Amino acid sequence: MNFSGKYQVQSQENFEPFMKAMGLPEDLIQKGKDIKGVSEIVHEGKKVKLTITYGSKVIHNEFTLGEECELETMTGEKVKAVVKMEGDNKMVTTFKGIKSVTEFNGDTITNTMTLGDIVYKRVSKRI
Ligand SMILES: CCCCCCCC/C=C\CCCCCCCC(=O)O
Numbered sequence: 681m682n683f684s685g686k687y688q689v690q691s692q693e694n695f696e697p698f699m700k701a702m703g704l705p706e707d708l709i710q711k712g713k714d715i716k717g718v719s720e721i722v723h724e725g726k727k728v729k730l731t732i733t734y735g736s737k738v739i740h741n742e743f744t745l746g747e748e749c750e751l752e753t754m755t756g757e758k759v760k761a762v763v764k765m766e767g768d769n770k771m772v773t774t775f776k777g778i779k780s781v782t783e784f785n786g787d788t789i790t791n792t793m794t795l796g797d798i799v800y801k802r803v804s805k806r807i
Pocket residue numbers: 708712734735736737739741752753754
């Protein structure tokens with residue numbers, strides 16, 4: 681039912697603690713929080729690509745469902761991660777030591793990132 685779609689972020693919880701625990705400068709977050717990022721999901725034969733645009737930068741990625749693929753970080757470091765779907769509105773993806781759960785709906789897309797007791801949730805609407 682749910683396969684590929686355009687979604688736009690409208691709100692996020694927690695910033696300062698999330699970035700601090702990672703390595704993102706508060707300067708960049710402030711500018712990004714006031715800007716509604718963009719999210720585009722491309723579904724092509726089990727191969728789903730995730731695209732995120734920030735201000736004037738476009739980020740494109742590729743991953744295979746039920747298969748561990750190597751993705752680069754914002755620092756250029758190569759990390760291994762396995763993304764798998766659980767079915768309807770439920771998908772389980774874990775990398776290194778962080779738990780990421782994304783709920784897939786035919787109208788809204790929510791992402792859950794937990795690191796160091798920090799809760800990061802992205803709310804996006806269908807467009
Ligand atoms: C898979 C890689 C995803 C990691 C990136 C997500 C973190 C977002 C970090 C910064 C977003 C803000 C960047 C926007 C460009 C700033 C504009 C400027 O250059 O002045």
